[PDB]
Amino acid sequence: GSIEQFINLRTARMFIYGGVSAVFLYKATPVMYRWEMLPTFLVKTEAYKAREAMIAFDNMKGIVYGPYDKGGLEGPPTKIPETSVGMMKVDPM
Instruction: List residues near another protein by CB under 8 A.
Output: 86-90
Closest CA to 66 of 76, 53, 55, 52: 76
CB of 86 vs another protein, minimal distance in Å = 5
Task: Give the phi and the psi of residue 11 in degrees, each rounded to 5.
Answer: -70, -25
Question: Closest distance between another protein and the C-beta of residue 91, in Å?
Answer: 11
| CA nearest to 63, candidates 79, 86, 84 | 79
In the chain, the amino acid numbered 48 is: Y
CA atoms of 17 and 23, how far apart (whole Å)? 10
